[PDB]
């Protein structure tokens, strides 16, 4: 998993960014958010996630808001 806080999120359009200490920002999309409840991140929350990449580039997965 990895630690991060979410840089900002567009609740409305559902994508945003998680900055990570040392590396560069990772893009989350609402569909990487695990849990149960409506899929949005408040800016500033402390997520643990995974980074996944293929041809569109690294992007966050398994974003557990904390659920």
What does the model show?
By secondary structure, the protein is mainly beta. The protein has a single domain (1-67), classed as Nucleic acid-binding proteins (OB fold (Dihydrolipoamide Acetyltransferase, E2P)). 0% of the residues lie in helices and 46% in strands. The protein is built from no helices and six strands. It has strands spanning 3-9, 15-19, 26-29, 33-34, 46-52, 59-64. A six-stranded mixed sheet has the order 3-2-1-5-6-4, with no helix packed on it. A hairpin with a 6-residue loop joins strand 5 (46-52) and strand 6 (59-64). It is globular, with a radius of gyration of 11 Å. It starts with a strand and ends with a strand. The relative contact order is 0.31. It is classed as transcription regulation. Keywords: transcription regulation. The assembly is monomeric. The entry is titled "crystal structure of the bacillus subtilis major cold shock protein, cspb: a universal nucleic-acid binding domain". The protein is cold shock protein B(cspb).
């Amino acid at each position: 998993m990895l630690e991060g806080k979410v840089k900002w999120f567009n609740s409305e359009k559902g994508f945003g960014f998680i900055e990570v200490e040392g590396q560069d920002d990772v893009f989350v999309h609402f569909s990487a958010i695990q849990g149960e409840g409506f899929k949005t991140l408040e800016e500033g929350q402390a997520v643990s996630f995974e980074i996944v990449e293929g041809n569109r580039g690294p992007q966050a997965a398994n974003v557990t808001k904390e659920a």
